[PDB]
Design a protein around this ligand. Structure first.
Ligand code: HEM
Length: 152
């Protein structure tokens, strides 16, 4: 678990992200798609995007970025007591979308990267460490649900 101090660093920087959900959202998905091309193949919706320019220019990709971050934010703000917000997500990602846990790890690295570029002042080592732990907690609980369903 994260301490009250670690959660503070996480939510303090996440408030900065909420000031521009769409901008952070498009950057994170683009980072994910460029860094790990195999994640892009999972999305029938964005499978056609070949260049980075095409990705930045897509309104639907940007719309999905909002959906991912808002859903992540609801989880983060629960500070661990996110069972009700996490279960539905794991169920659909395991059985419907078929997202392996490794991809959730890839998107966590993409999130940490984007937060560093956009908010260097409020995302130093300490804050980066806290966010990493919160994203691990996220993956840990999802994996436990995946195992239960038989997707581990
Ligand atoms: C930060 C982690 C993530 C969060 C919070 C998240 C959240 C969501 C949400 C809220 C939806 C829409 C409702 C639903 O089906 O649950 C969704 C859909 C989807 N997600 Fe994720 N997701 C995450 C990571 C990923 C990753 C890593 C992949 C693929 C590699 C992925 C692939 C998909 C796909 C394919 C859909 C269906 C899109 C469509 O056709 O509308 N997600 N996700």
């Amino acid at each position: 678990v994260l301490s009250e101090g670690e959660w503070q660093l996480v939510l303090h920087v996440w408030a900065k992200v909420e000031a521009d959900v769409a901008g952070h959202g498009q950057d994170i998905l683009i980072r994910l798609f460029k860094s790990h091309p195999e994640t892009l193949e999972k999305f029938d919706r964005f499978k056609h995007l070949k260049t980075e320019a095409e990705m930045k220019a897509s309104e639907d990709l940007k719309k999905h970025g909002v959906t991912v971050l808002t859903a992540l934010g609801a989880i983060l703000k629960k500070k661990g007591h996110h069972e009700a917000e996490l279960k539905p997500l794991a169920q659909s990602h395991a059985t419907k979308h078929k997202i392996p846990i490794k991809y959730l790890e890839f998107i966590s690295e993409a999130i940490i990267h984007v937060l560093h570029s956009r908010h260097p002042g409020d995302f130093g080592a300490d804050a980066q460490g806290a966010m990493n732990k919160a994203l691990e907690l996220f993956r840990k609980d999802i994996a436990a649900k995946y195992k239960e369903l038989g997707y581990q």
